[PDB]
XYZ file of C-alpha atoms in Angstrom:
696
model
C 0.000 0.000 0.000
C 2.939 2.328 0.633
C 5.130 3.743 -0.350
C 7.050 4.266 -3.596
C 9.580 6.974 -4.479
C 7.640 7.981 -7.597
C 4.678 8.795 -5.361
C 6.472 10.380 -2.409
C 8.307 13.070 -4.377
C 5.228 13.756 -6.509
C 2.602 13.985 -3.762
C 5.196 15.770 -1.635
C 5.626 18.532 -4.187
C 1.882 18.337 -4.719
C 1.346 19.282 -1.072
C 4.422 21.414 -0.374
C 2.354 24.616 -0.284
C -0.847 23.230 1.235
C -0.095 25.371 4.278
C -0.921 28.610 2.487
C -4.725 28.318 2.287
C -4.950 27.187 5.918
C -2.642 30.017 6.984
C -5.056 32.357 5.222
C -7.615 30.761 7.523
C -7.827 30.908 11.312
C -6.644 27.423 12.221
C -3.014 27.297 13.356
C -0.167 29.784 13.810
C 3.246 30.586 12.350
C 4.234 30.483 8.687
C 2.520 28.292 6.093
C 5.314 25.774 6.649
C 4.226 24.991 10.206
C 0.482 25.014 9.530
C 0.812 22.806 6.453
C 2.692 20.032 8.219
C 0.361 20.510 11.180
C -2.510 19.980 8.745
C -1.035 16.830 7.207
C 0.150 15.345 10.508
C -3.435 15.666 11.719
C -4.858 14.280 8.471
C -2.862 11.104 9.101
C -4.995 10.606 12.209
C -8.171 11.334 10.247
C -9.927 8.238 8.848
C -6.760 6.601 7.546
C -3.308 5.222 8.265
C -0.310 7.227 9.464
C 0.321 8.268 5.868
C 0.473 12.063 5.565
C 2.693 12.059 8.661
C 5.679 11.628 6.351
C 4.128 13.689 3.551
C 3.993 16.633 5.961
C 7.784 16.973 5.788
C 7.664 18.501 2.305
C 5.481 21.352 3.548
C 7.376 21.511 6.837
C 10.393 23.362 5.444
C 17.898 24.326 9.022
C 20.033 21.395 7.878
C 20.486 20.285 11.487
C 16.721 20.440 11.970
C 15.903 18.291 8.944
C 18.408 15.454 9.411
C 17.332 14.767 12.992
C 13.599 14.908 12.248
C 13.272 12.229 9.569
C 14.606 9.530 11.901
C 11.587 9.838 14.195
C 9.658 8.532 11.188
C 10.270 5.828 8.584
C 9.787 1.673 3.386
C 12.161 4.483 2.450
C 15.202 3.414 4.470
C 15.820 6.924 5.778
C 17.306 7.403 2.331
C 14.573 8.362 -0.134
C 13.336 11.227 2.047
C 16.207 13.712 2.342
C 16.799 13.390 -1.396
C 13.111 13.830 -2.210
C 13.113 16.829 0.128
C 15.536 19.238 -1.552
C 14.106 18.256 -4.944
C 10.707 19.751 -4.107
C 12.103 23.113 -2.976
C 13.926 23.551 -6.290
C 10.815 22.672 -8.304
C 9.047 25.741 -6.903
C 11.763 28.071 -8.187
C 11.543 26.232 -11.501
C 7.757 26.537 -11.384
C 7.951 30.270 -10.700
C 10.803 32.473 -9.498
C 5.643 41.736 3.281
C 3.064 40.157 0.977
C -0.564 40.215 2.135
C -2.986 37.409 2.986
C -6.415 38.638 1.891
C -5.241 39.358 -1.655
C -7.391 37.657 -4.304
C -6.198 35.766 -7.380
C -5.740 38.092 -10.348
C -6.668 37.237 -13.931
C -4.069 35.854 -16.332
C -6.132 37.557 -19.029
C -6.252 40.868 -17.160
C -3.655 41.444 -14.389
C -5.473 44.592 -13.266
C -8.576 42.590 -12.369
C -9.083 39.920 -9.696
C -11.423 36.964 -9.131
C -14.259 37.486 -6.603
C -14.827 34.805 -3.963
C -16.970 32.217 -5.750
C -16.902 28.411 -5.887
C -15.901 26.442 -8.985
C -18.949 25.389 -10.985
C -19.273 25.040 -14.754
C -22.970 25.641 -14.133
C -24.354 28.964 -12.860
C -20.863 30.232 -11.964
C -19.213 32.127 -14.833
C -15.920 33.563 -13.501
C -15.742 37.330 -14.013
C -12.612 39.296 -13.020
C -13.816 42.424 -11.223
C -12.586 45.059 -8.783
C -10.100 43.960 -6.121
C -11.904 42.739 -3.003
C -10.003 41.232 -0.070
C -10.845 37.739 1.194
C -11.870 36.984 4.779
C -10.320 34.091 6.706
C -13.786 32.755 7.524
C -14.227 31.977 3.831
C -10.909 30.128 3.820
C -11.957 28.173 6.915
C -15.145 26.900 5.288
C -13.000 26.300 2.215
C -10.623 24.118 4.224
C -13.733 22.614 5.848
C -14.453 20.985 2.491
C -10.758 20.562 1.685
C -10.474 18.633 4.957
C -13.302 16.184 4.269
C -12.413 15.516 0.630
C -8.686 14.919 1.113
C -9.661 12.378 3.768
C -12.410 10.780 1.679
C -10.299 10.550 -1.477
C -7.531 7.952 -1.636
C -3.816 8.670 -1.341
C -2.743 8.711 -4.983
C -2.122 11.277 -7.732
C -5.315 10.405 -9.613
C -7.242 11.157 -6.415
C -5.546 14.206 -4.890
C -5.016 16.101 -8.156
C -8.727 16.642 -8.836
C -9.463 17.553 -5.203
C -6.655 20.113 -5.101
C -8.096 21.404 -8.374
C -11.757 21.408 -7.363
C -11.155 23.761 -4.440
C -7.796 25.495 -4.924
C -8.472 26.887 -8.401
C -9.629 30.468 -7.855
C -7.117 31.166 -5.094
C -3.809 32.981 -5.584
C -0.569 31.017 -5.267
C 1.371 34.053 -4.068
C -0.590 36.869 -2.425
C 0.950 39.738 -4.395
C -0.508 42.525 -6.536
C -0.849 41.078 -10.028
C -0.302 37.389 -9.314
C -2.006 35.352 -12.024
C -0.616 31.978 -10.982
C -3.364 29.688 -9.702
C -2.762 27.800 -6.463
C -3.521 24.416 -8.021
C -1.332 25.030 -11.069
C 1.491 26.159 -8.790
C 1.505 22.959 -6.740
C 0.737 20.954 -9.888
C 4.058 21.189 -11.719
C 5.947 21.080 -8.431
C 4.794 17.468 -8.489
C 5.495 17.174 -12.215
C 8.948 18.760 -12.323
C 10.080 16.999 -9.137
C 8.974 13.579 -10.376
C 10.673 14.314 -13.691
C 14.100 15.321 -12.375
C 14.110 12.337 -10.011
C 13.810 10.161 -13.111
C 16.677 12.163 -14.605
C 18.802 11.034 -11.669
C 18.690 14.290 -9.734
C 19.444 12.758 -6.347
C 20.302 15.460 -3.792
C 23.912 16.642 -3.561
C 23.456 22.628 -10.654
C 21.976 23.632 -14.016
C 21.879 20.823 -16.585
C 20.131 19.424 -19.658
C 18.313 16.820 -17.564
C 14.858 18.090 -18.540
C 12.486 17.400 -21.441
C 9.598 19.368 -22.931
C 7.408 17.263 -25.220
C 4.484 18.487 -27.329
C 2.216 16.392 -29.540
C -0.517 17.404 -31.967
C -2.203 16.351 -35.209
C -2.516 18.049 -38.600
C -5.641 17.589 -40.708
C -8.053 17.778 -37.782
C -10.708 19.897 -39.494
C -10.422 18.001 -42.787
C -11.002 14.789 -40.828
C -14.202 15.789 -39.039
C -16.550 17.555 -41.462
C -14.860 16.733 -44.777
C -15.342 12.968 -45.031
C -18.084 12.867 -47.666
C -19.796 9.779 -46.267
C -23.255 9.498 -44.732
C -23.406 10.601 -42.196
C -23.948 13.152 -41.046
C -24.253 15.300 -37.921
C -24.102 12.239 -35.667
C -20.855 11.295 -37.410
C -19.364 14.772 -37.013
C -19.709 14.221 -33.271
C -18.438 10.642 -33.508
C -15.152 11.592 -35.177
C -14.969 14.458 -32.686
C -15.543 12.153 -29.713
C -12.884 9.883 -31.202
C -10.070 12.433 -31.357
C -10.413 12.931 -27.603
C -9.749 9.219 -27.090
C -6.859 9.027 -29.553
C -5.320 12.035 -27.810
C -5.346 10.755 -24.235
C -4.620 7.243 -25.498
C -1.311 8.489 -26.894
C -0.810 10.522 -23.718
C -1.861 7.861 -21.201
C 0.598 5.526 -22.919
C 3.350 8.080 -22.299
C 2.373 8.468 -18.646
C 2.495 4.706 -18.085
C 5.664 3.706 -19.945
C 7.665 6.675 -18.658
C 5.967 6.308 -15.281
C 4.642 9.856 -15.021
C 1.474 11.407 -13.602
C -1.344 13.642 -14.852
C 0.502 16.514 -13.174
C 3.088 16.317 -15.962
C 0.298 16.790 -18.495
C 0.005 20.568 -18.813
C -3.143 20.040 -20.880
C -4.745 17.697 -23.414
C -7.816 18.631 -25.430
C -8.928 18.220 -29.035
C -5.678 16.495 -29.935
C -3.380 19.260 -28.699
C -1.241 18.432 -25.661
C 2.137 19.129 -24.065
C 3.882 17.272 -21.251
C 6.922 17.925 -19.066
C 9.386 15.037 -18.825
C 13.062 14.351 -18.137
C 16.028 14.211 -20.510
C 17.327 10.641 -20.407
C 18.359 8.150 -23.130
C 15.696 5.854 -21.655
C 12.963 8.460 -22.148
C 13.896 9.305 -25.743
C 14.090 5.602 -26.599
C 10.414 5.078 -25.781
C 9.381 8.556 -26.900
C 10.606 7.400 -30.299
C 9.006 3.993 -29.731
C 5.585 5.468 -28.961
C 5.868 7.980 -31.811
C 7.003 5.462 -34.435
C 3.986 3.249 -33.741
C 1.613 6.187 -33.289
C 2.577 7.345 -36.776
C 2.069 3.764 -37.983
C -1.464 3.255 -36.628
C -3.354 6.196 -38.171
C -1.955 5.045 -41.523
C -3.597 1.622 -41.312
C -6.920 3.084 -40.174
C -7.341 6.651 -41.424
C -4.464 6.882 -43.902
C -4.845 8.655 -46.102
C -6.802 10.836 -43.699
C -5.030 12.390 -40.713
C -1.588 12.170 -39.096
C 0.001 12.746 -35.688
C 3.066 14.873 -34.946
C 4.939 14.476 -31.659
C 8.191 16.293 -30.885
C 10.287 16.965 -27.785
C 13.004 19.522 -27.059
C 15.677 19.037 -24.373
C 15.414 22.089 -22.119
C 17.368 23.188 -19.043
C 16.174 23.808 -15.494
C 17.074 27.494 -15.595
C 15.096 27.935 -18.813
C 11.849 28.253 -16.853
C 11.726 31.972 -16.110
C 13.366 35.347 -16.666
C 17.035 36.330 -16.613
C 17.710 39.986 -17.371
C 14.416 40.551 -19.156
C 14.696 37.424 -21.284
C 11.765 35.019 -21.605
C 13.847 31.826 -21.517
C 10.726 29.655 -21.272
C 8.734 30.978 -24.237
C 11.961 30.989 -26.249
C 12.212 27.275 -25.489
C 8.501 26.904 -26.216
C 9.158 28.739 -29.481
C 11.653 26.126 -30.674
C 9.281 23.302 -29.772
C 6.477 24.872 -31.813
C 8.779 25.023 -34.835
C 9.268 21.254 -35.082
C 5.512 20.674 -35.219
C 4.773 23.117 -38.043
C 7.761 21.822 -40.015
C 6.629 18.201 -39.815
C 3.060 19.360 -40.437
C 4.297 20.128 -43.944
C 5.700 16.614 -44.268
C -23.068 8.543 -29.021
C -26.508 9.012 -27.448
C -26.981 6.534 -24.588
C -25.702 6.670 -21.007
C -22.034 7.539 -21.505
C -20.485 8.839 -18.283
C -17.031 8.133 -19.678
C -14.605 5.578 -21.086
C -12.504 2.805 -19.570
C -9.032 2.097 -20.926
C -8.768 -1.661 -21.434
C -6.489 -4.206 -23.084
C -6.503 -4.101 -26.881
C -7.308 -7.815 -27.187
C -10.354 -7.602 -24.918
C -13.804 -7.258 -26.482
C -16.992 -5.519 -25.373
C -15.434 -2.211 -26.391
C -16.912 0.420 -28.707
C -13.841 1.461 -30.696
C -10.133 0.621 -30.975
C -7.146 2.900 -30.432
C -3.381 3.164 -31.029
C -2.330 1.407 -27.814
C -5.578 0.513 -26.043
C -9.328 0.010 -26.373
C -12.226 1.800 -24.685
C -15.465 0.566 -23.123
C -18.545 2.846 -23.051
C -19.679 3.380 -19.453
C -16.061 0.222 -14.544
C -12.913 -1.283 -16.069
C -10.107 -1.378 -15.569
C -7.196 0.718 -14.328
C -7.522 4.011 -16.207
C -11.013 5.391 -16.814
C -11.627 8.589 -18.780
C -14.525 10.062 -16.805
C -16.337 12.928 -18.523
C -17.078 16.442 -17.238
C -16.589 15.914 -13.499
C -14.094 16.014 -10.632
C -15.479 13.114 -8.581
C -14.509 9.465 -8.998
C -16.226 6.995 -6.689
C -15.000 3.701 -8.115
C -13.133 0.515 -7.203
C -9.890 1.226 -5.328
C -7.888 -1.338 -7.308
C -5.408 1.359 -8.330
C -8.031 2.632 -10.773
C -6.359 5.656 -12.365
C -9.028 8.364 -12.376
C -8.631 10.359 -15.591
C -11.101 13.279 -15.773
C -11.656 15.079 -19.075
C -13.877 18.021 -19.994
C -15.513 18.375 -23.401
C -18.176 20.545 -25.027
C -20.669 17.905 -26.127
C -24.036 19.642 -25.880
C -26.648 18.642 -28.441
C -30.362 19.223 -28.937
C -31.903 15.945 -27.797
C -33.868 14.080 -30.456
C -37.046 12.292 -29.225
C -36.720 8.809 -27.701
C -33.355 9.883 -26.286
C -31.048 10.723 -29.174
C -29.187 13.425 -31.080
C -30.999 15.883 -33.352
C -30.084 15.886 -37.041
C -29.491 18.737 -39.496
C -33.187 18.763 -40.388
C -34.259 18.693 -36.734
C -32.276 21.860 -36.024
C -33.580 23.714 -39.069
C -37.227 22.764 -38.540
C -37.124 24.614 -35.218
C -35.853 27.780 -36.905
C -37.779 31.056 -36.710
C -39.230 32.457 -39.924
C -37.369 30.725 -42.734
C -36.136 27.227 -41.924
C -32.427 27.382 -42.705
C -29.631 25.598 -40.855
C -27.279 27.786 -38.832
C -23.523 27.242 -38.717
C -21.035 29.168 -36.581
C -17.237 28.899 -36.613
C -14.382 30.878 -35.098
C -11.371 31.138 -32.821
C -9.569 33.449 -30.420
C -7.783 36.443 -31.929
C -4.024 35.901 -31.626
C -4.297 33.113 -29.059
C -0.757 32.003 -29.868
C 0.841 35.350 -29.054
C -0.832 35.080 -25.654
C 1.337 32.028 -24.982
C 4.488 34.105 -25.487
C 3.647 36.828 -22.967
C 4.106 34.302 -20.157
C 7.479 33.397 -18.649
C 6.896 30.469 -16.295
C 5.281 27.014 -16.578
C 2.941 28.200 -13.811
C 1.377 30.940 -15.924
C 1.225 28.437 -18.783
C -0.865 25.935 -16.827
C -3.177 28.667 -15.527
C -3.755 30.422 -18.852
C -4.245 27.127 -20.689
C -6.629 25.651 -18.115
C -8.777 28.771 -17.720
C -8.876 28.845 -21.511
C -10.204 25.299 -21.658
C -12.710 25.966 -18.871
C -14.654 28.289 -21.169
C -15.002 26.432 -24.470
C -15.306 23.029 -22.777
C -17.014 23.868 -19.494
C -18.817 27.197 -19.322
C -19.856 27.050 -22.975
C -22.561 24.564 -21.981
C -24.147 26.867 -19.423
C -24.000 29.612 -22.046
C -25.680 27.489 -24.714
C -28.354 26.276 -22.294
C -28.953 29.975 -21.686
C -27.497 31.275 -18.436
C -25.194 33.998 -17.084
C -27.867 36.423 -18.268
C -26.802 39.328 -16.068
C -23.199 39.230 -17.278
C -24.091 38.699 -20.941
C -26.998 41.143 -20.789
C -29.370 41.894 -23.648
C -28.100 40.584 -26.976
C -29.311 40.518 -30.603
C -32.195 38.032 -30.619
C -34.931 36.681 -32.878
C -36.674 35.026 -29.931
C -36.525 34.233 -26.227
C -34.148 31.405 -25.343
C -35.936 27.992 -25.505
C -36.386 25.417 -22.744
C -33.826 23.181 -24.440
C -31.925 25.145 -27.150
C -31.740 23.697 -30.662
C -27.946 23.868 -30.687
C -25.349 21.185 -31.428
C -21.600 21.497 -30.867
C -19.450 19.473 -33.248
C -16.374 20.595 -31.323
C -15.376 23.603 -29.225
C -11.941 24.976 -28.396
C -9.952 28.201 -28.277
C -8.103 27.166 -31.423
C -11.414 26.527 -33.216
C -15.060 25.849 -32.406
C -17.677 24.443 -34.779
C -21.273 24.839 -33.617
C -24.498 24.208 -35.537
C -28.205 24.612 -34.812
C -31.287 26.678 -35.637
C -30.126 29.767 -37.531
C -31.841 32.211 -35.172
C -30.445 30.288 -32.209
C -27.033 30.379 -33.876
C -27.218 34.128 -34.488
C -28.010 35.116 -30.900
C -25.611 32.512 -29.490
C -22.765 34.157 -31.408
C -23.198 37.256 -29.244
C -23.839 35.401 -25.988
C -20.459 33.717 -26.371
C -18.700 36.991 -27.209
C -19.996 39.086 -24.307
C -19.281 36.195 -21.952
C -15.814 35.623 -23.405
C -15.205 39.360 -23.162
C -16.190 39.335 -19.492
C -14.403 36.032 -18.873
C -11.143 37.503 -20.175
C -11.795 40.973 -18.767
C -12.188 42.345 -22.278
C -8.587 41.520 -23.139
C -9.140 38.536 -25.430
C -11.519 38.639 -28.392
C -13.172 36.343 -30.933
C -13.762 36.179 -34.670
C -16.927 34.466 -35.897
C -18.306 33.632 -39.324
C -22.037 32.949 -39.532
C -23.640 30.879 -42.273
C -27.297 30.203 -43.028
C -27.487 27.421 -45.602
C -30.006 24.857 -46.825
C -30.909 21.824 -44.703
C -30.171 19.283 -47.434
C -26.657 20.466 -48.270
C -23.229 18.815 -47.787
C -21.542 19.884 -44.546
C -18.070 20.410 -46.044
C -19.541 22.676 -48.717
C -21.189 24.819 -46.050
C -18.076 24.614 -43.878
C -15.692 26.141 -46.418
C -17.998 29.155 -46.710
C -18.121 29.867 -42.977
C -14.382 29.223 -42.706
C -13.784 31.747 -45.483
C -16.215 34.202 -43.906
C -14.183 33.685 -40.743
C -10.939 34.472 -42.573
C -12.489 37.716 -43.829
C -13.324 38.846 -40.288
C -9.715 38.180 -39.307
C -8.492 39.873 -42.478
C -10.541 42.946 -41.609
C -8.789 43.338 -38.263
C -9.883 40.603 -35.787
C -12.579 41.046 -33.106
C -15.272 40.966 -35.781
C -18.425 39.058 -36.660
C -19.524 37.985 -40.130
C -23.289 37.976 -39.666
C -24.417 37.408 -43.251
C -22.963 37.737 -46.746
C -23.987 40.930 -48.512
C -23.271 43.261 -51.423
C -20.896 46.219 -51.119
C -19.083 48.899 -53.123
C -15.574 47.824 -54.126
C -13.261 50.685 -53.164
C -11.393 49.199 -50.208
C -13.447 51.265 -47.774
C -16.495 49.083 -47.138
C -15.925 45.965 -45.050
C -18.137 42.876 -44.907
C -17.699 41.634 -41.340
C -19.167 43.690 -38.496
C -17.374 44.886 -35.388
C -18.938 43.308 -32.293
C -19.899 46.520 -30.489
C -20.819 48.102 -33.823
C -23.372 45.508 -34.951
C -24.888 45.153 -31.484
C -25.534 48.899 -31.454
C -27.067 48.717 -34.933
C -29.401 45.934 -33.824
C -30.355 47.618 -30.545
C -31.154 50.853 -32.390
C -32.832 49.607 -35.574
C -34.413 46.211 -34.809
C -36.972 47.486 -32.264
C -38.247 49.888 -34.946
C -39.486 46.980 -37.059
C -39.284 43.752 -35.056
C -41.686 42.888 -32.234
C -40.121 39.570 -31.253
C -40.935 35.928 -32.001
C -41.529 36.168 -35.751
C -43.634 39.315 -35.429
C -43.166 42.865 -36.680
C -44.234 46.011 -34.834
C -47.884 47.029 -35.156
C -46.988 50.068 -37.250
C -45.430 47.656 -39.748
C -48.720 45.975 -40.675
C -49.531 45.375 -44.360
C -46.222 47.106 -45.081
C -43.961 44.062 -45.303
C -43.037 45.244 -48.786
C -41.419 48.352 -47.310
C -38.598 46.369 -45.702
C -37.056 44.638 -48.718
C -37.906 47.644 -50.887
C -35.701 49.641 -48.529
C -33.048 46.992 -49.144
C -33.156 47.393 -52.920
C -32.685 51.122 -52.325
C -29.483 50.247 -50.467
C -28.404 48.234 -53.517
C -28.332 51.568 -55.336
C -25.853 52.832 -52.749
C -23.799 49.696 -53.391
C -23.286 50.692 -57.028
C -22.498 54.346 -56.272
C -21.961 55.613 -52.688
C -21.248 59.255 -53.598
C -24.778 59.769 -54.902
C -27.897 60.588 -52.875
C -30.008 58.062 -54.810
C -30.574 56.084 -51.613
C -31.507 58.992 -49.334
C -34.128 60.505 -51.649
C -35.907 57.157 -51.958
C -35.605 56.385 -48.246
C -37.554 59.578 -47.576
C -40.909 59.592 -49.356
C -41.493 55.833 -49.420
C -41.931 56.143 -45.663
C -44.379 58.988 -46.255
C -46.447 56.782 -48.551
C -46.869 54.306 -45.694
C -47.079 57.030 -43.055
C -43.870 56.271 -41.167
C -41.736 59.359 -41.791
C -40.439 59.208 -38.215
C -38.225 56.111 -38.342
C -34.830 55.691 -40.031
C -33.558 59.274 -39.630
C -30.033 58.209 -40.608
C -31.042 56.623 -43.914
C -33.019 59.659 -45.076
C -30.498 62.408 -44.306
C -27.078 62.960 -45.864
C -24.055 62.305 -43.645
C -20.916 64.187 -44.691
C -19.820 64.023 -41.048
C -18.769 60.406 -41.608
C -17.279 61.009 -45.056
C -14.370 62.980 -43.598
C -13.712 59.915 -41.443
C -13.207 57.661 -44.466
C -16.062 55.555 -43.090
C -19.202 54.696 -45.043
C -22.884 55.592 -44.687
C -25.336 54.099 -42.150
C -27.465 52.904 -45.074
C -24.654 50.489 -45.967
C -24.771 48.491 -42.733
C -28.546 48.457 -42.284
C -29.043 45.319 -44.402
C -27.391 43.084 -41.805
C -30.297 44.011 -39.552
C -33.122 44.068 -42.105
C -32.288 40.735 -43.755
C -31.999 38.839 -40.461
C -35.366 40.229 -39.358
C -36.870 39.482 -42.774
C -35.758 35.846 -42.817
C -37.248 35.581 -39.327
C -40.724 36.574 -40.529
C -40.936 34.809 -43.900
C -43.777 32.458 -44.898
């Protein structure tokens, strides 16, 4: 039952700073060192063996004091303790290198803003960095109150303590200083990872060497593998090949963790096929890193080939290359080299599924095969990929709890299934067209270069994944209404939204559904993502409204190209709908987020009354709307001509509505001197959406 050296150094570095949150509470006294060991020495007495008694040493720290304190306690042979001791202390400096105590965690997205005291919940708890408000010890006490009962309930192993230290110590600062963006969990996460790594590199206690590895693995034709197959099909399949990539990813990762004997703490992240792990630089490691790779590159060939391929590379880095020396980002510069190898070689469903169980490849009863292992739709056996949760509750036969989050929301088809393309479009408002949204985060890669430590990396990457894989579901189901506020809408948000996510991630998200529920959702995500990142990180989104019975890849290239246009036009934008324009390099197609939302808010209430209805004053005058659009088409052919204003003046008088649209009737030279175009140009993106919401 206990204890190994590749579980003492890990869990030791995993709990080396467990004394901080209890020090920020009212429990013990002295520094976090004393209170942490005092917490673990007491936890050994709490519903369990005398286990954490020895684990308390890592948080307990002089050289006279340490050598005559290990004897009192144990097997290790009084040998594997002193060596595992100094290792942990160095990992912290490698992780990140009178403060306060009530200082809140600040946002990695916005250092000027901090996270208000709220529990971690992907439902009804969207994290919003606000003004700096100090934290009371009473809130830490009731925090530890849960942290006390869960650390005791959960078993003593990495797959058990990692999610508990993550479930509670996420939105708490690691170092109480003004501007600290390093999460507590992420801080003590790599301290386990880096320590375990260097121990494998032969870093027994006695300085800077090449005994450290930094491996990253990712695929290539991911998008061309999901929605560009050309085989019925369809929607259900899009999700299937999406829910397959998640298995292939971990599979390749969980094979690395086993063979090299690592933990999930070494895994910085792993989602949608993109992952990066921290390992050690040894000839043993490389030998099986090449072994795993060589066969990983050989398996997709005999299954998908010629379809998709995997690219895994690793760069030998040094221990000092983890921070800043004289204003030099040694870490990102090392991360830069690693990213180069990838790009270079890149050139060359519905029933009860709570998760997957990693089995032996020869065993049956599975649902699909993998590169190194099979998977059973769910308890068996050792490693089980449990979905969207932090709680295991399974056999204690060394069952490696592997939690994974994924955006897998879908409109539920009757008799318990997944809605199809026609089921999403039939629930549309007005015209019955299918809605397709696609986009990414503006310059997400350059955000990974601003950081300087592995700590900031783990925090920024994890928070990132929390949105598109966690909080995106509560957004789609229609929550966080106060934060998001009023948004462009064709209707009120349904009981169960007609929205299906093929896949969602910061790098790219593909979501389909009812066109009017796709339109509004595009703004709900933005305003949330703006608030989630403090308004520091933005999105680009292309919106398509195609026919129900139309090939997905054909209607994917369009949205992807509409997306490219939004990026090409400067990056924060939304491509609502395709439209005509004058070609002079002055009129853009995509809308700016704040711009379009103001246009909707100002113009839509003039004509639209909600839920497929127009305002009362717009009765028997449906012809006015599109006839005001054709007048705009005149502007399209010649802007510098008041052919649009004169006609958008008396046509209203014929119908007796000379009060509305004061910007389309009058001339606006005031905007001409700004190089910008007329308000009549943009008004179609509001009229057409309303019109297709009231057709038939």
